[PDB]
């Protein structure tokens, strides 16, 4: 009995290419297929042009490339209807679409301007693949009470995705945090914003940096919070002066200063030592069961003065956590579903209090004493447990195990993983065990394909069908062949830069078995690719070797980047950043925009065959009617903890 399957992204997008996988399972000879999208509900025939045939050459696997226009069509999600007709047979599914065009990033020359100093800004404009596209953009400049004081409307057509711009700050105007907002003329709701402060300032001639010996304070730490103050001119040179330091406690957004913690220390040879004592910190509140102070944060303001009296600088390290344990423990990179009997790969996430990944930290589970595993440079630890073939929820609890910490000082956390719920409770499973390290484009990743089923229908399974999500779109969809008696097959996955920052892998097979029942068994896995520019960009020095240049002197600048690329330059007196270092552009900031835009909401797997598919950004609709829970929510499941 032939079966045709349709596989698409969970949520489509306007004015961009999407892809969907056509498959002919168990059919003979060439099968011609026509695919058509219609507005919903009714008929507009928004895209029909595409036709294709599934040759026995290419194991009946199809390629769908299409671009949905943006015709004259709210608050209620709009959809579309993908209709794929193999020969005469006609399968179709009802999916969600978004007006979200892509992304927008804004760059300002400085982080902070004075009244009457012009602000330069660039709007980088791109699609969901972070490729430069050309649309029309609107750009507002709100003052600090939110009122647009200027807008323009600009097109990025033939501008290689880069819109230069400026705005002359008026002479009198409110100081405060201004904002630049921009959206695609197609989709007003997805707005983009960067800020910039407007203040009156002269630039400072050094930077000041405050630092706790620990990234947190331990409540039972008799020594109190120790802090090293550091000053050095912008031209790199050490500072002499005296510096006033003072502390406080934060609760939520609420801030209490400890007036008594005020200390005046000498800043000698660019550095100084100073401390909040446990006593002041408690008196300062009022000696409540110290335990009470748990969860709140500390902060230190330092203010240096040069001995010349010429120039002052403030600076503050904020929200240092008050904690009973140094480390935190997270299961949000570990799936929430295992396969009974099969080894479960645990991705424990171990953050310092602040939020930073903690390196080389040991972890293990409740039960077994011998099992240990450190944390690679990504604050990640790979532990694998062999599970029992029992239809019982598997509760795991992990716990730190650092020598030199007391068992009370160690940190734990618990999660609950449910078994994969098969079809007709047949006990047929698929596992993808993937060696887990820092993957890098070029490196080759092995995907262990492990088959779990009674040899009865084992000979039947001939092939695995695999797919790759990335930046929420299909990046590849292929087949992995299998021969009877095999439970393990290994997939050579070349890893190119197109995989960054992270890609999803969903493999599924299908068969008839038990009692004439049409089945689908599957598995989804998330893997970080070590983030970094997709091409490259570097700006080193021109003169291979040299002494410091001199005011007004010629210097040669070297730029190593992708052929034909456009570079946009700016150099900024680092003295600015001592007044404001916020709202700068980072590539890391972009990767962060791209992940929060993932349509896949789970680290791995599915509750059922049909979950694996909706968890990664996907839908599976087959002739035999086995489709996936249709998706009609734009965002992922509102966090339920």
């Amino acid at each position: 009995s032939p079966m045709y399957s349709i596989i698409t992204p969970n949520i489509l997008r306007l004015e961009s290419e999407e892809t969907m996988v056509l498959e002919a399972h168990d059919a003979q000879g060439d099968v011609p297929v026509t695919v058509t999208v219609h507005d919903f509900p009714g008929k507009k025939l928004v895209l029909s042009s595409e036709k294709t045939v599934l040759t026995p050459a290419t194991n009946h696997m199809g390629n769908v490339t299409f671009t949905i226009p943006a015709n004259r069509e709210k608050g209620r999600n709009k959809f579309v209807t993908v209709q794929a007709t193999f020969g005469t047979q006609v399968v179709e599914k009802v999916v969600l679409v978004s007006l979200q065009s892509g992304y927008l990033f804004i760059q300002t020359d400085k982080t902070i301007y004075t009244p009457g100093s012009t602000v330069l800004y660039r709007i980088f404009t791109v699609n969901h693949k972070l490729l430069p596209v050309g649309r029309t953009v609107m750009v507002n400049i709100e003052n600090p009470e939110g009122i647009p004081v200027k807008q323009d409307s600009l097109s990025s057509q033939n501008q290689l995705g880069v819109l230069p711009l400026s705005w002359d700050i008026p002479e009198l105007v409110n100081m405060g945090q201004w904002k630049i907002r921009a959206y695609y003329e197609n989709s007003p709701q997805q707005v983009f914003s960067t800020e910039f402060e407007v203040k009156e300032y002269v630039l400072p001639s050094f930077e000041v940096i405050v630092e706790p010996t620990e990234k947190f304070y331990y409540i039972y730490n008799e020594k109190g919070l120790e802090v090293t103050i550091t000053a050095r001119f912008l031209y790199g040179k050490k500072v002499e002066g005296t510096a006033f330091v003072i502390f406080g406690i934060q609760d939520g957004e609420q801030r209490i200063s400890l007036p008594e913690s005020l200390k005046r220390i000498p800043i000698e040879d660019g550095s100084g030592e100073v401390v909040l004592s446990r006593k002041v910190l408690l008196d300062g509140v009022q000696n409540p069961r110290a335990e009470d102070l748990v969860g709140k944060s500390l902060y230190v303001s330092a203010t240096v003065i040069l001995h010349s009296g010429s120039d002052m600088v403030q600076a503050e390290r904020s929200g240092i956590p008050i904690v009973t344990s140094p480390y935190q423990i997270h299961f949000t990179k570990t799936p929430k579903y295992f396969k009974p009997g099969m080894p479960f790969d645990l991705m424990v996430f171990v953050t310092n209090p602040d939020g930073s990944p903690a390196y080389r930290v040991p972890v293990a589970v409740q039960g077994e004493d011998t099992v240990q595993s450190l944390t690679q440079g990504d604050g990640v630890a790979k532990l694998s447990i062999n599970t029992h073939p029992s239809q019982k929820p598997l509760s795991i609890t992990v716990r730190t195990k650092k020598q030199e910490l007391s068992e009370a000082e160690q940190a734990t956390r618990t999660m609950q993983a449910l078994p994969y719920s098969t079809v007709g409770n047949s006990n047929n499973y698929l596992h993808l065990s993937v060696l887990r390290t820092e993957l890098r484009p070029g490196e080759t990743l092995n995907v262990n394909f492990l088959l779990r089923m009674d040899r009865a229908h084992e000979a039947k399974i001939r092939y695995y069908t695999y797919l790759i999500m990335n930046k929420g779109r299909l990046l590849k969809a292929g087949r992995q062949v299998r021969e009877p008696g095999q439970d393990l097959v290994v997939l050579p996955l070349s890893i190119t830069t197109d995989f960054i920052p992270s890609f999803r892998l969903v493999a599924y097979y299908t068969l008839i078995g038990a009692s004439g029942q049409r089945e689908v068994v599957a598995d989804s896995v998330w893997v970080d690719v070590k983030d970094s520019c997709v091409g490259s960009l570097v700006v080193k020095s021109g003169q291979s070797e040299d002494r410091q240049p001199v005011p007004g002197q010629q210097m040669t600048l070297k730029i190593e980047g992708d052929h034909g690329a456009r570079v946009v330059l700016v150099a900024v007196d680092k003295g600015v950043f001592v007044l404001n270092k916020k709202n700068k552009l980072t590539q890391s900031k972009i990767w962060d925009v791209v992940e929060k835009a993932d349509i896949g909401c789970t680290p791995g797997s599915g509750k059922d065959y049909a979950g694996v598919f909706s968890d990664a950004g996907l839908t599976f609709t087959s002739s035999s009617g086995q489709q996936t829970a249709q998706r009609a929510e734009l965002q992922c499941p509102q966090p339920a903890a």
Binding site: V550, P551, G552, Q553
Partner: protein, 84 residues
């Protein structure tokens, strides 16, 4: 007369080398006009070094200076070439 002593010879070479430059200083100073302010700011300080150095008849000051002025002269040429 005969020949000069060691000091005597070296000292008089440096000097004339030095002079050799101070001669066509003014020509240089004048090419700075077109050039970015660093050139002017530079040559003027280098010029004096020389003239004092030259009149001071002391080897150090004279060579040290010999070189200062040499450099900036070269940084002028390099400059005027990227401009035709």
């Amino acid at each position: 007369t005969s020949l000069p002593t060691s000091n005597e010879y070296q000292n008089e070479k440096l000097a004339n080398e030095l002079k050799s430059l101070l001669d066509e200083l003014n020509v240089n100073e004048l090419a700075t006009g077109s050039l970015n302010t660093y050139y002017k700011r530079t040559i003027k300080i280098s010029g004096q070094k020389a003239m004092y150095a030259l009149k001071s008849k002391d080897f150090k000051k004279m060579s040290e200076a010999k070189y200062q002025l040499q450099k900036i002269y070269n940084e002028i040429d390099e400059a005027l070439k990227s401009k035709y």
